Write a protein that binds this ligand. Structure first.
Ligand SMILES: [Mg+2]
Ligand SMILES: [Mg+2]
Ligand SMILES: [Mg+2]
Lengths: 198, 86
């Protein structure tokens, strides 16, 4: 149904909430009965239509000319740190980061687990071969950016169904969480200078 | 004390449920006004301070009676309304 503002525009008249409510109530009474032709037109005046769109946008794959092989290139961004991950569809399990091996670039076990997440999800763990370039921020931020980029580059080689799973696993959604600016007259953006009653 | 015992204020529990039978006896005493009287009679209450109680009670009973009636009279018209959005 129209908003209150749209009926206000249609009649060139200020309205009250109660009034709007009364009317819409009446249009429900109208829809409640057998619907004639002019009846339907009438209620169509007060009808509007709204869009809804949900799909993770699917990149068509890209077959490289050199080996004749297909790859997909993802970009994740988390918290001062961006990563790009090219995933090759036929792998040895090789995963290279900034030109060095992923074990050496993430000596923190936790990070390697984060990395393992999408691949262990899609059971592809050995199947794929990834090249990686990441910059900005500290280690966990980096491992997470690679998580996002990878899980993004992994939806070319996955089935249309597993995509909604990765969404509900929350893999492809960015982390909105970031540092909050200190505020002046305070300490930590939240933390305040110790307050004195006396 | 001169009366035969166990005839007065006696419930006998049926099918062995005690709590139910106690609720029952309680409903007896409270229906007859004995609980309000025990509680009243823990301490004294002076004659004046008693007519005040009486009168406040009886006013309040009148009000609630009337208001009840009025409510149950207007009850019909609680029905969902015919003329809406005239
Ligand atoms: Mg702090
Ligand atoms: Mg005795
Ligand atoms: Mg009385």
């Amino acid at each position: 149904w129209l908003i209150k503002e749209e009926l206000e525009e249609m009649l060139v008249e200020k309205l009250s909430d109660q009034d709007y409510a009364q009317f819409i109530r009446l249009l429900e009474r109208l829809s409640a009965l057998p619907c004639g032709a002019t009846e339907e037109d009438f209620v169509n005046r007060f009808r509007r239509s709204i869009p809804x769109x949900x799909x993770x946008x699917x990149x068509x794959x890209x077959x490289x000319x050199x080996x004749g092989m297909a790859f997909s290139r993802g970009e994740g961004k988390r918290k001062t740190a961006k990563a790009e991950v090219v995933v090759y569809g036929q792998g040895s399990g090789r995963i290279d980061v900034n030109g060095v091996d992923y074990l050496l670039y993430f000596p923190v076990t936790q990070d390697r687990e984060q990395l393992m997440f999408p691949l262990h999800f899609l059971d592809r763990l050995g199947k794929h071969d990834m090249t990686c370039a990441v910059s900005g921020g500290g280690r966990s931020a980096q491992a997470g950016a690679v998580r996002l980029a990878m899980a993004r580059a992994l939806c070319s080689f996955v089935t249309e169904d597993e995509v909604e799973w990765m969404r509900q696993a929350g893999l492809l959604t960015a982390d909105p969480r970031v540092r909050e600016r200190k505020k002046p007259g305070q300490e930590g953006a939240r933390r305040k200078f110790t307050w004195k009653k006396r | 004390a001169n009366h035969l015992k166990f005839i007065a204020r006696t419930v006998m529990v049926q099918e062995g449920n005690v709590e139910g039978a106690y609720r029952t006896l309680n409903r007896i005493l409270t229906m007859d006004g004995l609980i309000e009287d025990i509680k009243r009679r823990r301490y004294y209450e002076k004659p004046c301070r008693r007519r005040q109680r009486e009168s406040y009670e009886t006013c309040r009973r009148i009000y609630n009676m009337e208001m009840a009636r009025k409510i149950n009279f207007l009850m019909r018209k609680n029905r969902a309304d015919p003329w809406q959005g005239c």
